[PDB]
Symmetry: D2
Amino acid sequence: MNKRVKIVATLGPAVEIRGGKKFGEDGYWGEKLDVEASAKNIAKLIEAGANTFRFNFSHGDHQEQGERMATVKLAEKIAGKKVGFLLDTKGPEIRTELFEGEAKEYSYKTGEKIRVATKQGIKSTREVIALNVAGALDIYDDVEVGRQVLVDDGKLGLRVVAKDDATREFEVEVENDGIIAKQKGVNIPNTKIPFPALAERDNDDIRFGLEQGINFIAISFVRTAKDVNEVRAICEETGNGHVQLFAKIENQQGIDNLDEIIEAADGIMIARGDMGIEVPFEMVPVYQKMIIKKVNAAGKVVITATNMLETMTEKPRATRSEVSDVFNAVIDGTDATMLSGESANGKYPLESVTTMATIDKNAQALLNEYGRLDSDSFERNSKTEVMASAVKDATSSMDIKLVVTLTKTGHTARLISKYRPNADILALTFDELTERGLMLNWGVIPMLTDAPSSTDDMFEIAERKAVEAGLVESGDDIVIVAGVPVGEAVRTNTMRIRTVR
Amino acid sequence: MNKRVKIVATLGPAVEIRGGKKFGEDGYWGEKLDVEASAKNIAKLIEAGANTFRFNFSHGDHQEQGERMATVKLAEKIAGKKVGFLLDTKGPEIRTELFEGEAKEYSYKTGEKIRVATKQGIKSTREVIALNVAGALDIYDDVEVGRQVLVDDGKLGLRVVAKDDATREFEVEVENDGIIAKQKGVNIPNTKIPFPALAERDNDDIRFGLEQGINFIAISFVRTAKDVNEVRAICEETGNGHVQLFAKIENQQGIDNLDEIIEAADGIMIARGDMGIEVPFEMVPVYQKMIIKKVNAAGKVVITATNMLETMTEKPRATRSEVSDVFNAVIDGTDATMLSGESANGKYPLESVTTMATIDKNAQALLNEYGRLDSDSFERNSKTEVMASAVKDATSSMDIKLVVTLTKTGHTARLISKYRPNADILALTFDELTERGLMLNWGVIPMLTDAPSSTDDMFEIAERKAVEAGLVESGDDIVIVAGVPVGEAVRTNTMRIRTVR
Amino acid sequence: MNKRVKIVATLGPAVEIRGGKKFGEDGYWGEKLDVEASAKNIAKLIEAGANTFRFNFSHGDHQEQGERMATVKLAEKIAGKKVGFLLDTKGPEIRTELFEGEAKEYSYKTGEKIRVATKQGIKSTREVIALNVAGALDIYDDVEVGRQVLVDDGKLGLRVVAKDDATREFEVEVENDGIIAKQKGVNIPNTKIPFPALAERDNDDIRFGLEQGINFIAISFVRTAKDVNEVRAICEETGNGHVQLFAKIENQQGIDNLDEIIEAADGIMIARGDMGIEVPFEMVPVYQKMIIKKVNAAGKVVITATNMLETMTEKPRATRSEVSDVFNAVIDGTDATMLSGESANGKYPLESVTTMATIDKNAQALLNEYGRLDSDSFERNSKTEVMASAVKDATSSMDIKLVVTLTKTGHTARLISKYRPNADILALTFDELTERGLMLNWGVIPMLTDAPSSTDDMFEIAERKAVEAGLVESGDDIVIVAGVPVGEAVRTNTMRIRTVR
Amino acid sequence: MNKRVKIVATLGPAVEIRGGKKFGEDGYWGEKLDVEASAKNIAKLIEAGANTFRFNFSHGDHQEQGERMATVKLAEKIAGKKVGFLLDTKGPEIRTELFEGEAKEYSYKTGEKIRVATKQGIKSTREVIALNVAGALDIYDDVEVGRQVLVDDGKLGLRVVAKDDATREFEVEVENDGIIAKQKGVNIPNTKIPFPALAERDNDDIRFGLEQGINFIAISFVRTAKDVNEVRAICEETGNGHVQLFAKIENQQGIDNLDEIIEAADGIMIARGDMGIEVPFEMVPVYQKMIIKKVNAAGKVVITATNMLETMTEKPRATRSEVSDVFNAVIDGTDATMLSGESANGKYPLESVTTMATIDKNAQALLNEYGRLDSDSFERNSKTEVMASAVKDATSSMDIKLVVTLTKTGHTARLISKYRPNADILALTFDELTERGLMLNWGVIPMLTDAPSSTDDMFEIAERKAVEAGLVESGDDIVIVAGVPVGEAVRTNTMRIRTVR
Ligand SMILES: O=P(O)(O)OC[C@H]1O[C@](O)(COP(=O)(O)O)[C@@H](O)[C@@H]1O
Ligand SMILES: O=P(O)(O)OC[C@H]1O[C@](O)(COP(=O)(O)O)[C@@H](O)[C@@H]1O
Ligand SMILES: [K+]
Ligand SMILES: [K+]
Ligand SMILES: [K+]
Ligand SMILES: [Mg+2]
């Protein structure tokens, strides 16, 4: 069977060979990138069901990112299959500074009183922790006594007891035993540090990705619709209006402003990593189910992210909790599941994609029994959406092997996908940008074909493409929708039930 | 407002003028039928909402019946509207004989002991009641002691206490006070008197009707599939294969064998008059709701009959119970409601059809709130049925003014009607027999058009005929289904949502 | 097996014997009332399932009404069973006057122009119909050009085309052929003739009935809460606070103000006879279902009335539409069904009550499958209501033969009845006025017992009363509720499931 | 709020202090157990919401197990709170043999051909792996070609490609790069190695636990009902009939025989660790949801086990997939969640129990919205179960703070728990064995109280104990059930709604 749930795989050195050396091996970083050998490894990830690669601009300079994007373009040719390109922004990250010395880290013990500096471009000491704040902002007047400075995946807590106006330093109490290492993530929950709607470094990263050729931007730490619309204006003004924007929800402001963020964006990445530090970790499952429902109801794409097969970074088998998490993300209604370090940096990138594909394919078989999404509740808000509802009805009434839509922009395919039919969706489109642009919608198999003339039989074309793709065989029943005829129809207006010859 | 629930109106002398005289006036029967004046009265019933006329062969000879059927054909020309023609068989009727002397009736009291004669071709006396049994059957060995002989709409009960082998007479006890009049209906419940599957009189009646031109036969007292199959054989062998058969369910065997009868017939007439004598009267509403559900599930036609506006036989207003009965039959899911003496014999035939139409129209507006049928529960058992389900879905998703089907045989219109869409159904068909044969399906407006060729745009035809009929205006949304293209499609395979120009 | 739906039977001369003569026989009103003979006939209606008798003060003087009420008290002793006493007011009736000089009626044809006079105390002529308006009100200023004057159960329409200020006469045109007879009902729909909130004639009839001993008042033509509250004030003033008020809903204003009327009243009588003249007849079934739902959700009593078995006034069997109407009133959720002329004036009063009881008992068995009422949707607004919901739950979980409630005021029985449990409700109460006041609540069997002391076993009392009433036998499971213990409990606070010894 | 989902915490050296050393400090095992210091750590796990401690007899001899149980009895005194004692059996085990020349492990590469010996009492070589099978059984005739030998938590796969009848050796191909170390766990999925229903080692370990005093036994690798019944016979024979048996379902045979095992057991432990090696890993979520539903429908206890907070063994915070897993186990309907190495052997035992309790408490607030279990579907199979349903109804109708049951054996408390009321359940019981035996039922707070006397007010006692436990305050509404009168009632037969003073 075809895997309806889409996989986003983050790329990094794990798949990359450097003069015959694998990531980890001594001298690895001293060798030149073997592009063909790296492209062949990426090809296997595509074959195992990666539908989109994530280029995380938090790690690796423009040269590294651009070389990896080029390597994927070769892998597509090797695999015989296209994938989406997704750029993930750095955004308003706060990290611990480098320490004085060749000190890489210091261990602390509960109750121990230390300070954190707000002055930028200075090194840390054991007793005065400095921060690398995005854009070198001064955060002193934005964090109150009683606020928490969390270091490294929220592992070490520092309680702001007092503030020293003389040095612009936070006096903090170590809440629990743990280490402060250099260049680790810092979270300061329930604060509104005035990060700009779009920082110059993200502006620059996005413009670089847009020049290379991308299909999706995942915008880190979206707080408001303005954070999405600043990125949209770049995409539009550079001639890249086709690029789709996924707002990453990972803090309380993003949760509070979710409805306006969904309205501005093409989709949501549930960024559970930061989210579970910024809000109570036990609320993340609540927010996940609610986000997936609301995004599906808006006919947009939802990606569930972070830790999904975390153990497979270092070990060959996923835990039972990881398998349950992937499975339940599908039942919740996610369009897509994501890998981060598992595919980018781990010992088992191919096995991670394969394992996620196996779970995702099994979970899709239970959506009839257990799925949370309920298409019967939707308002049908347009005639294309009325047709999408009729398609879902036909797939419920009888055994339909495949829904085919002839779609110029993918709008019809997006609306069919919204309704989660009991069938794969072959989206026949007429340009490569629309084709790749569909690769994260649940159930959709995008395929490039010639735009039909007013003299072509679009129903015979649908059947022939489905056969050429190996998706159907003689005696299978398919549902085909189209705008008929070409030049008269203003939208998808026809549904045909056809038996394959 | 189109009336979706269909009306069967029994014709009789009430609408018929004879040498300037209306029914009721002395010497009426001594004058000859005024055909033109009578056709003008019938055209008013057609205009008021009568969709089919019932010719009851229990009353009036082949001359009365044939002249009435000719008079309707003129009425259709006057109204500019066609109607269905339904023959209702006499069947295995038992009536009281004429009395010796010139006695018209005797009155009896609870406990009196009299006899019922089984000998055919004699006259009744006060003490020995003679029966006129269909086909002159001897019923003596077919009714046990403890059975009941009911005279005149079940009003007087006679208990069989003993049988006189010498005279072949039932000794009976009068069960309640009442009258035995001449030529009154007799019922003997929970007996299996071996009336033939098809009596010669019903054979001859049906053959006469088939010659005149009928669309429907309602078969009285259907007990088994064989009672229906014997009539089907005559229709087939006379080249009247198009004629549709309604089994009348009006005794316990009909109820017991209901599934096999529904399988053999095209529809059911719920013949509540006899039914509520032959079975406990308080079970009739239970059987009504059950039969409507079952016949609708089978994709067949159900007619609810008898006493629906009974008071309007004598009075110009129906009782509160009559209006409630018509309203509730629609809510239960009936395709059609019927009038017997109200339209045939009463003082207010036109007002009876008008009153029924007004109630049926109001009740159809409450089918979304109160409607008992549930199309969501059906197995979609064919590709045409899957398309019918998708049409229903489209009419639930958005405001659809009309569904149009291009239907050679009516099959697509019957399956759309089964699903009870929130829309009228325009059934475009290519012969008059198919057209009239759709006149009792819920919501169907049959309309004759030229068979489309492979060069015709069936979707433009649909819009044109709907605009011509005055059913849609500019801006209305319609659903159109057809088998496209003509000569290649083996069935209805296409649905279009179209805005009227 | 127990009849849960209650029957209100209207009393009159039909059951009354006079010097050995039955109603309709020659010199009937010549003879004196045989009280003992008449009381034996009424006891048979009690035994057949009449739960309350209606005394219609629209007909017969105080002496006739008081004697009839005395006859019922004897009938209760003969039957060994108590019934409720219900007074139905005259209210604001309009009747046609006597005609000039002994004359009875005239016939009229469509388009004919006559007058109706508003002056009170004068006789009609054929040309000038006079009205007997309740309280001799002058209606001339309260009826607009464009209204209709309907005579005799709405059968003849008179359109008001002009008004003659000189004579205070309506110039009317006959809308349809028909008859104006002396002393027939007149309706003038959608008018607000300023009938007082309480007329003197109704005050005097209500104070009379209260002096005789009644349990219920059904207030004709209720328009607002004020019409109910005026009668409440009489009941309060006279120490008859226990008397329950049923608003009769029978015009558009009553329908428009239904919510505030239900609030003010103890219940609603759906007075379909006048309603179906004052509003479009085809709307009565919609309003009937809606009123039953709203009154039940309020925890109050609804009576469905008028024409339920109308044919049985004159014939020994009801029509199929009459049986359907009674059956469907039960399915709709009525607490009670009513007989008017069928029990008061017809030839078959006993058969009418028996027939209604048979239908009501069969319909109650189909409430699980078809019942319109939905107790799952109610807000449980008090702890007694939560206990009523839990009782319903227990009767759905297992086979419960009987629910018993020990109730001082009947509150707990009313709430249990509201929930329509799958069981009869035995209401053990401690005074006859409470007992009689429960006789129209669905499923409630009221029974008089001593008030339990702090020392009594109320669960043993419940079982003993149920066994002595013949409602349960050994091995039956019952649900008993009570306020335990007496003296400490402030409401019904206990549910016990008990197996009968 | 009170935590309704129960926590099973496995005990081990993580919480144990030995001469002032914590587990993993140098010379830990050289110091003797500090019983007080260990009991103080254990008391903190109780206070954090551990409801039952698991004593895993797979690791540690009788002396270590008995000393650990004594330390828990002191911890209960420190906490002022009791916990359940659960014995987990060693059960059938296969382990890799020691290697010749005291070698520790060998590395192997995908595609290598090696051998597996079935001959017992023999050492492994790199080329010929030998197995230590429980009872030294000969495996050869139980394993067919196409089966797998999986080594070390299923990390290394060996496909059986051929068998050699002369050496009784399996020819295996290495399926992935990995290590075969000495004395590691081996799984052979989908085989029926004839391990005894109850091995002597398990028989002896169970008798030791029963003599120490336990409340639960979890039976490892239950394959059929006989594996439960053999343990039940030992509980019955030794006078320990109160001990409850949880079948561990962890292989294909246990799943195939689930219905008969649920019938024999008191509950199920979903042993996901072994299950996800023994069945396709992607099927575990399917089986988990199905087992929870079936065990709850049977009125029995289900524990979801293994890897729930696995990362917390080494790190102070759980992953997003782990929090999701715990949350979703609650939504699926689990009675209890379990910790293994997280509480027994990790760095953060107290943090692991606190985190699991935080997640379980948040998830229970979403059971109304998202809960999978459907109590409306259950057949109520006894009168106690009817009362449990009524209790649920009361908690759905109004805001109920607490359900109190006075329960002699816990049966009523088990049935209320089965229905998952919107309330905590205080189970007032009269002996410590019944008390401890309720500690894993969802929502049940067991509390030892004096048996009520014939003159006691059990409803007053319920209120008093609820206030004593701190579960209610003034104005709260509670539901109380009991068998009334005490001792004479055959079962719980009474429900009261009471307002707390
Ligand atoms: O029916 P809707 O939602 O208004 O959408 C109609 C729009 O869809 C489009 O058909 C695009 O649809 P496709 O890209 O699927 O062909 C536009 O041409 C049209 O304006
Ligand atoms: O889809 P189903 O139920 O098998 O029906 C197919 C049959 O219907 C027909 O199309 C008739 O349909 P119409 O009469 O509505 O045109 C036949 O040609 C065909 O064999
Ligand atoms: K990032
Ligand atoms: K009255
Ligand atoms: K174990
Ligand atoms: Mg009235």
